[PDB]
Amino acid sequence: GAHLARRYLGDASVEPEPLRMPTFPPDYGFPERKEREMVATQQEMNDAQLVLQQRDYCAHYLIRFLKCKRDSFPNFLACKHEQHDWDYCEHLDYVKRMKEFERERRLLQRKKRREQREADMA
Amino acid sequence: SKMELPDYKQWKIEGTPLETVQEKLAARGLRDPWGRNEAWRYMGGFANNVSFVGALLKGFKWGFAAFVVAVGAEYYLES
Amino acid sequence: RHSIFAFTHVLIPVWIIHYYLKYHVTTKPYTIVEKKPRIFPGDTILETGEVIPPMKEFPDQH
Amino acid sequence: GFILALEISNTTHYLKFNYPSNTFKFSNLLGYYPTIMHRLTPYMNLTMSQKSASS
Amino acid sequence: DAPPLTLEGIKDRVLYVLKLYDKIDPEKLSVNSHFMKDLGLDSLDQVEIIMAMEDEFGFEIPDIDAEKLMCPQEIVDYIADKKDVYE
Amino acid sequence: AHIEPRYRQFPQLTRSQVIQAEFFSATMWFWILWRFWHDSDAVLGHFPYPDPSQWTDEELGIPPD
Amino acid sequence: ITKDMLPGPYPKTPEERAAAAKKYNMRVEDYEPYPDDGMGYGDYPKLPDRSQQERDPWYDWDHPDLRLNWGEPMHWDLDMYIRNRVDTSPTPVNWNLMCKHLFGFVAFMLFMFWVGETYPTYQPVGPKQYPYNNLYLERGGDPNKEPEPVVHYEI
Amino acid sequence: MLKYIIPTMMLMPLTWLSKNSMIWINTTLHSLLISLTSLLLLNQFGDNSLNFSLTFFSDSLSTPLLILTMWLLPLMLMASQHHLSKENLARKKLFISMLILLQLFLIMTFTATELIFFYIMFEATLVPTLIIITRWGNQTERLNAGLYFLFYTLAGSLPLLVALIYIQNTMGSLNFLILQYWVQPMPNSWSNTFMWLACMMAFMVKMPLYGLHLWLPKAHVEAPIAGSMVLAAILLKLGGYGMMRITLLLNPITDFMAYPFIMLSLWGMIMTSSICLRQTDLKSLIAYSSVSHMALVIVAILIQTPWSYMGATALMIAHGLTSSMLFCLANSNYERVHSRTMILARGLQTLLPLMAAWWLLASLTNLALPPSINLIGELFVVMSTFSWSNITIILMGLNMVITALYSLYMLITTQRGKHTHHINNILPSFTRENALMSLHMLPLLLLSLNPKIILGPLY
Amino acid sequence: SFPKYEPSRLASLPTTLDPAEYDISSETRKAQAERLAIRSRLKREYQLQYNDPSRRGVVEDPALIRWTCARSANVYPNFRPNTKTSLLGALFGIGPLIFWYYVFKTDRDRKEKLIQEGKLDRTFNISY
Amino acid sequence: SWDKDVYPEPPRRTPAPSPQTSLPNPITYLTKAFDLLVDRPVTLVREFIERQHAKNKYYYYHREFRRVPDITECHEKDVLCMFEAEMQWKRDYKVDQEIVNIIQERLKACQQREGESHRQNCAKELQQFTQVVKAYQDRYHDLGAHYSARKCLAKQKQRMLAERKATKEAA
Amino acid sequence: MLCLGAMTTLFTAMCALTQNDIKKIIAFSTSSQLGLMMVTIGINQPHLAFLHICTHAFFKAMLFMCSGSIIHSLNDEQDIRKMGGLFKAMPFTTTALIIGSLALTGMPFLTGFYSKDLIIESANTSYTNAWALLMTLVATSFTAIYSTRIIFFALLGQPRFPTLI
Amino acid sequence: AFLPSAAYLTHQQKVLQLYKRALRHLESRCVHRDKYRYFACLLRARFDEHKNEKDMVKATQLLREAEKEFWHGQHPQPYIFPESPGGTSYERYECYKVPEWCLDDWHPSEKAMYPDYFAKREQWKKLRRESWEREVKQLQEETPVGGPRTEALPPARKQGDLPPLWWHIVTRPRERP
Numbered sequence A: 001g002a003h004l005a006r007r008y009l010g011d012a013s014v015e016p017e018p019l020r021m022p023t024f025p026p027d028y029g030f031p032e033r034k035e036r037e038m039v040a041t042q043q044e045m046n047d048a049q050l051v052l053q054q055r056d057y058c059a060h061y062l063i064r065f066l067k068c069k070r071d072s073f074p075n076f077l078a079c080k081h082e083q084h085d086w087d088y089c090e091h092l093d094y095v096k097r098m099k100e101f102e103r104e105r106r107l108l109q110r111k112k113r114r115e116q117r118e119a120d121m122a
Numbered sequence B: 001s002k003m004e005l006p007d008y009k010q011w012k013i014e015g016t017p018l019e020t021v022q023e024k025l026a027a028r029g030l031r032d033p034w035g036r037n038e039a040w041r042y043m044g045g046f047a048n049n050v051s052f053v054g055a056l057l058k059g060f061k062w063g064f065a066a067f068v069v070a071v072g073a074e075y076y077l078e079s
Numbered sequence C: 001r002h003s004i005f006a007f008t009h010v011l012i013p014v015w016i017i018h019y020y021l022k023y024h025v026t027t028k029p030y031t032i033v034e035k036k037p038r039i040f041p042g043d044t045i046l047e048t049g050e051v052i053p054p055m056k057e058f059p060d061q062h
Numbered sequence D: 001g002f003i004l005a006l007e008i009s010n011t012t013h014y015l016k017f018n019y020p021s022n023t024f025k026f027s028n029l030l031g032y033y034p035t036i037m038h039r040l041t042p043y044m045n046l047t048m049s050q051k052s053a054s055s
Numbered sequence E: 001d002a003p004p005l006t007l008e009g010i011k012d013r014v015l016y017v018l019k020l021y022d023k024i025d026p027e028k029l030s031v032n033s034h035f036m037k038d039l040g041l042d043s044l045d046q047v048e049i050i051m052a053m054e055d056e057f058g059f060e061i062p063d064i065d066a067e068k069l070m071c072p073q074e075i076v077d078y079i080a081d082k083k084d085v086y087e
Numbered sequence F: 001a002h003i004e005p006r007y008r009q010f011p012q013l014t015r016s017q018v019i020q021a022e023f024f025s026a027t028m029w030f031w032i033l034w035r036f037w038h039d040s041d042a043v044l045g046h047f048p049y050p051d052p053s054q055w056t057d058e059e060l061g062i063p064p065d
Numbered sequence G: 001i002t003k004d005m006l007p008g009p010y011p012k013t014p015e016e017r018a019a020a021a022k023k024y025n026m027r028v029e030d031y032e033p034y035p036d037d038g039m040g041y042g043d044y045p046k047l048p049d050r051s052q053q054e055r056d057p058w059y060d061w062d063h064p065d066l067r068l069n070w071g072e073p074m075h076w077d078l079d080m081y082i083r084n085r086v087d088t089s090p091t092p093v094n095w096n097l098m099c100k101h102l103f104g105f106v107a108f109m110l111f112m113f114w115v116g117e118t119y120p121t122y123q124p125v126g127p128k129q130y131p132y133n134n135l136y137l138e139r140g141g142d143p144n145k146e147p148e149p150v151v152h153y154e155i
Numbered sequence H: 001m002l003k004y005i006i007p008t009m010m011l012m013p014l015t016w017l018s019k020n021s022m023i024w025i026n027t028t029l030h031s032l033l034i035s036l037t038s039l040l041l042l043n044q045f046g047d048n049s050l051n052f053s054l055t056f057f058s059d060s061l062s063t064p065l066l067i068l069t070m071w072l073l074p075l076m077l078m079a080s081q082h083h084l085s086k087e088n089l090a091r092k093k094l095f096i097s098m099l100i101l102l103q104l105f106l107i108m109t110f111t112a113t114e115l116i117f118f119y120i121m122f123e124a125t126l127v128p129t130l131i132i133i134t135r136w137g138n139q140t141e142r143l144n145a146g147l148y149f150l151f152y153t154l155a156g157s158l159p160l161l162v163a164l165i166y167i168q169n170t171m172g173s174l175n176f177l178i179l180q181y182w183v184q185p186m187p188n189s190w191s192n193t194f195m196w197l198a199c200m201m202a203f204m205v206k207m208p209l210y211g212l213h214l215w216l217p218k219a220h221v222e223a224p225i226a227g228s229m230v231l232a233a234i235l236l237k238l239g240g241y242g243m244m245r246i247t248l249l250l251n252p253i254t255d256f257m258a259y260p261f262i263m264l265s266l267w268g269m270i271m272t273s274s275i276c277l278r279q280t281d282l283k284s285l286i287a288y289s290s291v292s293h294m295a296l297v298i299v300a301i302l303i304q305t306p307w308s309y310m311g312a313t314a315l316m317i318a319h320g321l322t323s324s325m326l327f328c329l330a331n332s333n334y335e336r337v338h339s340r341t342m343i344l345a346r347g348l349q350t351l352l353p354l355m356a357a358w359w360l361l362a363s364l365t366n367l368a369l370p371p372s373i374n375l376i377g378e379l380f381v382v383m384s385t386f387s388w389s390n391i392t393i394i395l396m397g398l399n400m401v402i403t404a405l406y407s408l409y410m411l412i413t414t415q416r417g418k419h420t421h422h423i424n425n426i427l428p429s430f431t432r433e434n435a436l437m438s439l440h441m442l443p444l445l446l447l448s449l450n451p452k453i454i455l456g457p458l459y
Numbered sequence I: 001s002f003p004k005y006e007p008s009r010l011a012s013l014p015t016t017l018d019p020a021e022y023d024i025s026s027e028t029r030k031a032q033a034e035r036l037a038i039r040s041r042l043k044r045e046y047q048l049q050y051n052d053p054s055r056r057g058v059v060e061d062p063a064l065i066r067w068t069c070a071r072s073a074n075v076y077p078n079f080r081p082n083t084k085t086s087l088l089g090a091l092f093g094i095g096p097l098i099f100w101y102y103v104f105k106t107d108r109d110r111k112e113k114l115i116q117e118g119k120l121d122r123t124f125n126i127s128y
Numbered sequence J: 001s002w003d004k005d006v007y008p009e010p011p012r013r014t015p016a017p018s019p020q021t022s023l024p025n026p027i028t029y030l031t032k033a034f035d036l037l038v039d040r041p042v043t044l045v046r047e048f049i050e051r052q053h054a055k056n057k058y059y060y061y062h063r064e065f066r067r068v069p070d071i072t073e074c075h076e077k078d079v080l081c082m083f084e085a086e087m088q089w090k091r092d093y094k095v096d097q098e099i100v101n102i103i104q105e106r107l108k109a110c111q112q113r114e115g116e117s118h119r120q121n122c123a124k125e126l127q128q129f130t131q132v133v134k135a136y137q138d139r140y141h142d143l144g145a146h147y148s149a150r151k152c153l154a155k156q157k158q159r160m161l162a163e164r165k166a167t168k169e170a171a
Numbered sequence K: 001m002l003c004l005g006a007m008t009t010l011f012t013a014m015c016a017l018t019q020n021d022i023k024k025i026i027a028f029s030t031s032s033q034l035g036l037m038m039v040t041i042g043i044n045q046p047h048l049a050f051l052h053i054c055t056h057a058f059f060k061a062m063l064f065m066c067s068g069s070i071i072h073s074l075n076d077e078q079d080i081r082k083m084g085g086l087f088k089a090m091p092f093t094t095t096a097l098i099i100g101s102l103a104l105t106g107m108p109f110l111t112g113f114y115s116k117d118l119i120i121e122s123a124n125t126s127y128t129n130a131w132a133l134l135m136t137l138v139a140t141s142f143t144a145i146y147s148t149r150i151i152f153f154a155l156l157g158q159p160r161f162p163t164l165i
Numbered sequence L: 001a002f003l004p005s006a007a008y009l010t011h012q013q014k015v016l017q018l019y020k021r022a023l024r025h026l027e028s029r030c031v032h033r034d035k036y037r038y039f040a041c042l043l044r045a046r047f048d049e050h051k052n053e054k055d056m057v058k059a060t061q062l063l064r065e066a067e068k069e070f071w072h073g074q075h076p077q078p079y080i081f082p083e084s085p086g087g088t089s090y091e092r093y094e095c096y097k098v099p100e101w102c103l104d105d106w107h108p109s110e111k112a113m114y115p116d117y118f119a120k121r122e123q124w125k126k127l128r129r130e131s132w133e134r135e136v137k138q139l140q141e142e143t144p145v146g147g148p149r150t151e152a153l154p155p156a157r158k159q160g161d162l163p164p165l166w167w168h169i170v171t172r173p174r175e176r177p
């Protein structure tokens, strides 16, 4: 929560707004940046009736966990592994979002250093 | 039917906080005429009540014993 | 007469309500509308036999 | 919260008698909200229900 | 729950609270020991006796009745009438 | 026999209420310690929280100019 | 009941005031009528505008629920000042101080909710990323049209 | 409709030839038989009204009011036979004859195919009601209440006579079935403005409109119990019936003539309900609540949407049963304590528990508890007035606060609290009284099972 | 020192904080004794009828009947049309009617102007 | 039963019960108990009642209203023809009401049946609902409580004048 | 919903800190928990709010039943300043009141841990009105304060109730 | 102030009532029994300090500022006994306190369920109706002219008489019916 103090009490030009980012292109700094792989077919997570918040890039572990949770009834404590798989891949997605946030903050620091160098140079 | 009240001569405030109250009253020239009326609350079975962490940790000893037995049971039962 | 509460208050209402739902309610359209059951990759349909094909192989993370 | 309220509870056994603050009277008289709103808002209706509308 | 009071039980409890009061010697006290004339007590002491009666039996005696209960038998009769004992 | 009322003293306790009260207190602490032994991450944390300041500019794509 | 015990017009002469006070079963020195502005009160006494909660509850009333005696001249708003209704009883804190404290607390809380809405907390993360063009067909997009390609990359 | 007119007229030799102990039993029995026969009027169709003859017809608006009218007569005979027990025998038969004559006038008021015959029956209902109030009312102010009830109504209705004869001379007819097809649009002129006022103000008085309601907290209060039952349950509804017949001819000028009167009801139902918060007279509280409930019917008829007419006719039938039961409860206490002051007899649930259950049920129907038809009419009117203008929900919702607040206050003041010590003639509930309460409440609760019969011609 | 209690319309002054409570003057003794005598005479007049075995009914209270007659029937014979009553009857009688008239009229003019210009979202509105 | 064309349901695809655990679920045993205790006696009672039906078979009929001339070809103030036009129009209005109710039932049954992916898998029912509500609104809305075929014809002629003016200004 | 729920759960839990009638304290407890439910609807977590309803029902009905056992055992006495010393005199009610208070405050792996803690973990880690979160946390501290106020004045200490037990 | 027998409170009565209200509010402030007992003896010393004050203006002034002391130091929610006015169980059982005259309205088939009770009620009603005229003529021969001065009632002066206006005091309902 130090970024709240850096955006509110410091300057907001170098701090990334949450509502509108990335403001930088995704290829800006990457040689041949590959896309994210979607494992679950659109028809598969359509027929699994997943919540639209849950149809992210890591819903295939959620499909495996819900199939486990159906097949292991009444033993409701018998699918901790599939639940931890889905929780770990949601954790990895959250780490990717933190990496996007830190990338945007470092590129705003780069733009700040760029404009200060252009003011000090010419 | 007829209930027997206990003796009034057994309620003495020595060893209770009423004694501390009466001493702090006699330190400024007062005396406590309702001490033996309040003396039963600090005596008998209502003396030595637990603290708050002793209140929360009611049954913690047997719970810890059952916990150690169950952890040893699953630590042996996996083999 | 030992478990007449399980006969008069439970079982006779299950009879009445099952008759009412089977021959008066489900005989009318859209009265008991059930959500269609959830389909996973790897299932076998009872009404068709069509095996749902399983998911693509995972990019294993751990 | 448990620690702070244990401190407040252990201070109750002490022989110190303070006058209550406005914080205590605000927390105890229900934020003064039923003392105001249940006296004022019925009054302004019921007088209006008799002096203005009825009579 | 709620055990019924009797005149003997109320009399025992009123005299019991008065035998635990350090301004009354418990050998001179009887059921008709007037507090200001026989026992020689202050009006403040009479107020404290009625407040101890209230804390004993659990119901408030109003002041228009508290300022007139001047012997323990009056207190027993008042608690009897306000609690309807010997039904 | 039901409980007789007492005067200015500690009331009569039944054996059953005491052993049931102690049994459910021990049940509570057994459950707290058991689930704390097994889960241990709903309280203390499930996954490690990574430090963003320790990340390299190479993996985040910050070309030096 | 008959005519001379019913309420009548506003008394002006002191003998009419005394007959009115005798009618309402109260002293002449305590009998104040309502001011004769023509609101329809007549000779009815202005009782001192208290709730019936303030009456002595240990007193033996003829009506214990109402705390009101038989023959006692009722307040004009007696149905208003019942104990199921508006209370005038003395409050431990002053009325103006209560109003100032409650208005200050509510206004300060609403101001701080406006401040926290202007300055919200959040987490150091980007947007949540969804496949299939931010789930275009799932969010109700029509299949005959085609969305612009929303592409998310690895990081 | 002659199969209901002739039995109602044969109630006159049935009551004038009965033995002196038999004139209540025979009239009650055969008026219940007429009320049983009234259900044949439910031969209604989705397009065509049940058109009997040149003179009489019955759609789905007149039909529930007819069933309620023919049902109200035995209940009035049960309510009124106790306080007329020491009455002279011939005056007792004159009272029953005035009730029979009023039923006769009402059942061909609601089925009048032609509007001047509607007017003649509509104003013929004054005379038995006037005679019942001013002859069998209890207090001195029954005479002034009869004067107010007569002279607000006639001052409203004689311009209606002039306007209906004008429609007769202009359109050529006053058949409602003809005027469904020959109705011409009514443009904006001052002549058509006073045409609208002359066609509407009589029914505005009979509803009553707020500001013109002053006859009612006398006429409903000073009347005997059968008079209060027929005034609250049926005679207010002649205004809404006549409005729903007459606003066919008043388009499109109504769309800007309704604006003052809508205000007069939307504020007026706030006022009279507020007045019910400070009524010391219980029967006057029920009267002002009747004004408060009929103000919604006035708004629903003036905004003239289908949901509004359905809610208005549901609320008319529901308020008929509810206000009739409330007056009968107030009379059941007046027959004991002999005073209409509400603060006098308190704590009556300790003394009369089943009668307090009837008080509870009539209070819950008064405050529009779902799924009662009180709530159905209330709710449909609120829906249509929200679609009319969205702000009106404020004046609706605030109304629904105050409507609760006097309904339970009436329940708390009379039935709850400590009972009054010096009142000791509180007899147990008679079987006639509980029968009366059930014959009000049980149809009002059974109509929630099948409410489509009380939802008017455009259900 | 101590904050003085400020009495209000809906929070009155306590009995013990009123400076007239401590009057030992003989005129206040006469007033309290005369009120005691009136109250005792009314009390005796009540409970003679209240304790009567022959009485079966309602002990009528002319104070109560007098109160209801003042609240109901005495209002118009003691009304005078003057400045105060005319301004209060115009302010509270036709004022809110004018207010709600202009509010509902402006709202319906705005709504009708939006509808006949094709601007109001009336897409599924078919119940009216 | 009903017609599956006016009340459509897609074919049900339930998956096969594939138990992973060795614990037997209570649902299958309770389904067997519901078959033995409940479904079979109710079935026997309905078979008895249906045999008592089949001992006396008789029929009712659906009433067919032949089309009378509408309000457009009735002379003005001619009640014998415009009466029939108005009755025909009221019956058509009540039937259009029931058509809108059928499409609402289709839409709501689709929403519950498709469950969580209802916004994607009920576009056709939503589109048919939008069309039939648009048609019902253009036909019968704002006619008032005193609606008639004359009111409906006047609304239609106003809409046709507006459409003709909008077509002429766009040419 | 977020600002209204945070306002309610602050205000009622603040009012509960100094009350003396035990049923008033538990009523402010349940209204503070309803304010927390309104908070977690306001952060777009409706299923955690419904989980907190289903969770809250058990221990809050049990805390009122324990209060009623105390009130009936002390002859219709509902004030906490005439209680005390009931740790041993009412041992089963003491056990269940401690378990209910720990389920209310969010003892780990009791029932209130399985919704309310997650609520806090979703109220922290979300794009939130920050003042609403901060008042939610102050209310969370106040819950522990009035819960141990109940435990201290009712169960712990010495007796204050009248002498006929 | 407002009392049935006396027209006023004496100064001594006002001091006693302020003393009792101050100790009750002090007990509300000072929850525990030893701590209350200490501060209650201190308050008793504060009342014993000005006990022998002979200037009635000075004593009335001290009582007035002692009332202001009490009004500043009162508890916002004082302890009220459950059956005291303002209590939690106050006037709770008033819905169960049916008066005796309703027993007169019972049906004879439900009076026959209790033969001895109603047979014993009949002699109570008979005793009341033969005592009523004697106690009315006792009240009128003893009340001074101008009506009664206080609301007190005389006792039964003769043997065989019952005290005047006794029925609704004796036949009041129980506190727990």
Ligand SMILES: CCCCCCCCCCCCCCCCCC(=O)OC[C@H](COP(=O)([O-])OC[C@H](O)COP(=O)([O-])OC[C@H](COC(=O)CCCCCCCCCCCCCCCCC)OC(=O)CCCCCCCCCCCCCCCCC)OC(=O)CCCCCCCCCCCCCCCCC
Residues within 6 Å of the ligand: H353, H354, H355, H356, H357, H358, H360, H361, H364, H365, H369, H370, H371, H372, H373, H442, H445, H446, H448, H449
């Ligand atoms: C066509 C066939 C229809 C068959 C089904 C019936 C349909 C409804 C008909 C009318 C039902 C009410 C009648 C009984 C109550 C009135 C009298 C009374 O109080 O008696 C107490 C008495 C029992 O009490 P007790 O201890 O002996 O003495 C009473 C005490 O003195 C003091 O007692 P108390 O105060 O303690 O208790 C009073 C209590 C008071 O209770 C309450 O105040 C609680 C009720 C309100 C809140 C809860 C309900 C809210 C609404 C939800 C329910 C409706 C929808 C439910 C469906 C799902 C959702 C859609 O009353 C009840 O609990 C009654 C239960 C039923 C209530 C129905 C709703 C009334 C509330 C107001 C209107 C609400 C909207 C309209 C609803 C209409 C539904 C059709 O009852 C009886 O002896 C029964 C008498 C005979 C009843 C006959 C009923 C039928 C009448 C019609 C005859 C012709 C058709 C043939 C049908 C025959 C069926 C067998």
Ligand SMILES: CCCCCCCCCCCCCCCCCC(=O)OC[C@H](COP(=O)([O-])OCC[N+](C)(C)C)OC(=O)CCCCCCCCCCCCCCCCC
Residues within 6 Å of the ligand: H152, H155, H156, H159, H162, H163, H166, H191, H192, H194, H195, H197, H198, H201, H202, H205, H212
């Ligand atoms: C309850 C008390 C209040 C009651 C209010 C009653 C309604 C108020 C308005 C009534 C106006 C009078 C009847 C109008 C009948 C209209 C018929 C008609 O065709 O009109 C068009 C006709 C038009 O004439 P025409 O139709 O013959 O002409 C052909 C058409 N033009 C005009 C185009 C050439 O109107 C009139 O001739 C005059 C109408 C206005 C009359 C004004 C006088 C009366 C004023 C109001 C009196 C209100 C009640 C007074 C008593 C109160 C209590 C004591």
Ligand SMILES: CCCCCCCCCCCCCCCCCC(=O)OC[C@H](COP(=O)(O)OCCN)OC(=O)CCCCCCCCCCCCCCCCC
Residues within 6 Å of the ligand: D034, D037, D038, D039, D041, D042, D045, D046, G083, G084, G085, G086, G087, H277, H394, H397, H398, H401, H405, K004
């Ligand atoms: C998301 C948005 C959230 C918005 C929140 C803020 C808006 C609302 C603000 C508060 C308004 C309501 C509160 C004020 C009225 C409270 C009335 C009440 O309950 O009074 C109680 C009173 C006696 O109770 P009490 O004294 O407390 O009891 C002590 C024990 N003897 O009882 C009485 O005196 C009886 C009185 C009976 C008659 C009452 C007359 C007044 C009625 C007021 C209705 C207000 C309607 C507002 C409509 C708004 C529409 C949008």
Ligand SMILES: *C(=O)CCCCCCCCCCCCC
Residues within 6 Å of the ligand: A001, A002, A003, A004, G121, G122, K124, K137
């Ligand atoms: C930055 O600090 C991000 C976290 C959210 C804003 C601050 C929240 C402060 C309250 C929670 C922590 C409390 C620790 C005692």
